[PDB]
Amino acid sequence: TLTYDDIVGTGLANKCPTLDDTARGAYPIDSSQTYRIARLCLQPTTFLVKEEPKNKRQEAEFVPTKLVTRETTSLDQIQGELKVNSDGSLTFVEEDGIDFQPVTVQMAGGERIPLLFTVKN
Amino acid sequence: GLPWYRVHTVLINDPGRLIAAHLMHTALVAGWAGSMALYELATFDPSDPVL
Ligand code: CLA
Ligand code: CLA
Ligand code: CLA
Ligand code: CLA
Ligand code: CLA
Ligand SMILES: CC1=C(/C=C/C(C)=C/C=C/C(C)=C/C=C/C=C(C)/C=C/C=C(C)/C=C/C2=C(C)CCCC2(C)C)C(C)(C)CCC1
Ligand SMILES: CCCCCCCCCCCCO[C@@H]1O[C@H](CO)[C@@H](O[C@H]2O[C@H](CO)[C@@H](O)[C@H](O)[C@H]2O)[C@H](O)[C@H]1O
Ligand SMILES: CCCCCCCS[C@@H]1O[C@H](CO)[C@@H](O)[C@H](O)[C@H]1O
């Protein structure tokens, strides 16, 4: 149960909450009850960029990159509807949240790749 | 005086200044190596070792 002053400057604000190794149970879904996701959090740990080959017929790989815009990358405080469909499946419909972050990663050799890391709509 | 093509003969009986001239030559050569590598790095395209 941490406060802002516990957290500020640590880098912890860009990390999503975690669950213990004990949390391996099952959350019962009642088809009659209405559901929502109160908080969805997404913490990127790796950004890969697909290379652009010269012969255009070679298999292009995703290569590792270096994050250069610091711990500003995570999506959080996202909320939305959690529907229970006819076939028993669930469907999350995003409605709001900090659901984007501009991110710049750098490729080997210096090329910078900005992207809008997002799950909008 | 010394003709132009003999100016460096003044080093023949001056071991200290000979060593200095050699130090300067070595400095120039190391400096060339450094400069050359910097220029190649400023111009080298590493994106395709195949072709
Ligand atoms: C490794 C190189 C080297 C070294 C260690 C020496 C060392 C020496 N020179 Mg020699 N010399 C050299 C090369 C060298 N020289 C070259 C290439 C020339 C033809 C220009 C000469 C012509 C020369 C004369 C006429 C004399 C000496 C003399 C001497 C002695 C006294 C120092 C002096 O006056 O230098 C003077 C030398 C220079 C000022 C070299 C000029 C620099 C050249 C032109 C390049 C310019 C440098 C710049 C950073 C690069 C430009 C890049 C470009 C894209 C613009 C000393 C033993 C003197 C001596 O003792 O006589 C008894 C003397 O009278 N030198
Ligand atoms: C280890 C290499 C080496 C060293 C330390 C020397 C040293 C010497 N040489 Mg010898 N020589 C050499 C190799 C060497 N030489 C080679 C390969 C040749 C055939 C090209 C000669 C042919 C030669 C002749 C015919 C004479 C000498 C003479 C001399 C003495 C006076 C040099 C002088 O004042 O020039 C002064 C030079 C200048 C002021 C300007 C020269 C500009 C040159 C021609 C063009 C630019 C050169 C460029 C900067 C080189 C870059 C590096 C190179 C490796 C690519 C000095 C003991 C003289 C001597 O014995 O006097 C008693 C003399 O008459 N040398
Ligand atoms: C005592 C042992 C000893 C050692 C280790 C050396 C080593 C060397 N001498 Mg020699 N020399 C010696 C005895 C020794 N000498 C004696 C007793 C004489 C008669 C006085 C000579 C006369 C002589 C002449 C005339 C010349 C040499 C040169 C050289 C150098 C040629 C290679 C070079 O420049 O690499 C490049 C250098 C490096 C990669 C870095 C080396 C790091 C330095 C040595 C650390 C500095 C430590 C120390 C405080 C400086 C002086 C060291 C001194 C023992 C050489 C090399 C460092 C030549 C030279 O100096 O050319 C530039 C040269 O012209 N020597
Ligand atoms: C094994 C390698 C090696 C050897 C043995 C030498 C030997 C020599 N270099 Mg060094 N040098 C080297 C590698 C070497 N170099 C490298 C890798 C670089 C970095 C590029 C240099 C950079 C360098 C500079 C900047 C200078 C030297 C000079 C010298 C000479 C000093 C003694 C002298 O007075 O000669 C007297 C001169 C001669 C005997 C004439 C040599 C003529 C050469 C072999 C060909 C010249 C071609 C043409 C006439 C001129 C070039 C074209 C022009 C349009 C640029 C000696 C011949 C100095 C020098 O030449 O002083 C005058 C000098 O200034 N060197
Ligand atoms: C201080 C130590 C040191 C180290 C670890 C290096 C390392 C390097 N140098 Mg640098 N360099 C140094 C000092 C050093 N250098 C100094 C003092 C100079 C000025 C002279 C240079 C000038 C220089 C140039 C101009 C270049 C390098 C280059 C390089 C790279 C290639 C090495 C190579 O291929 O050489 C090969 C070495 C040989 C083939 C040695 C030949 C030895 C002869 C055969 C010996 C003959 C006499 C001997 C006494 C015979 C008897 C031996 C006995 C055992 C029987 C490598 C990263 C290259 C590079 O990649 O640049 C970016 C390059 O072009 N260096
Ligand atoms: C002081 C100091 C420093 C610095 C240094 C430096 C910066 C150096 C540089 C150096 C350099 C930067 C050098 C360079 C050099 C070069 C050279 C030496 C070249 C030569 C050339 C030649 C000789 C050529 C010729 C020719 C021609 C031109 C044409 C063709 C043919 C031939 C090839 C012949 C430091 C900080 C470190 C520390 C200590 C102090
Ligand atoms: C004490 C002495 C130290 C001196 C230091 C000098 C070092 C010089 C050489 C080091 C390597 C330089 O490498 C340098 O990198 C980049 C990317 O390739 C190039 O930069 C070029 O490409 C980039 C990316 O496409 C463009 O944004 C830039 O406008 C363009 O000029 C430089 O043209 C090159 O010279
Ligand atoms: C004395 C050398 C100091 C200069 C070093 C310059 C940085 S290093 C430089 O970085 C660039 C961009 O990432 C690359 O394109 C290039 O290949 C690389 O050599």
Side-chain angles (χ1 to χ4, degrees), chain A residues 25-85:
Chain A
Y27 184 71
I29 300 298
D30 186 340
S31 176
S32 87
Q33 303 189 39
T34 269
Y35 292 91
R36 274 188 72 101
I37 289 178
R39 181 184 176 183
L40 171 65
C41 183
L42 286 109
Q43 188 202 315
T45 58
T46 303
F47 299 88
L48 296 166
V49 172
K50 181 179 275 183
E51 53 187 12
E52 289 168 355
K54 239 163 53 190
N55 62 331
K56 312 294 176 52
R57 281 168 66 115
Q58 171 207 338
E59 174 82 306
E61 300 166 335
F62 285 91
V63 295
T65 61
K66 261 165 164 179
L67 171 62
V68 294
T69 41
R70 308 175 70 188
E71 298 178 298
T72 60
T73 62
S74 278
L75 323 176
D76 203 0
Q77 308 196 43
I78 293 162
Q79 70 178 27
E81 186 186 15
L82 192 64
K83 308 206 261 203
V84 187
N85 307 324

Side-chain angles (χ1 to χ4, degrees), chain B residues 9-30:
Chain B
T9 58
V10 296
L11 296 178
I12 292 181
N13 279 310
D14 192 343
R17 291 203 159 171
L18 175 72
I19 288 170
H22 284 178
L23 279 161
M24 186 61 53
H25 185 261
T26 314
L28 285 161
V29 176

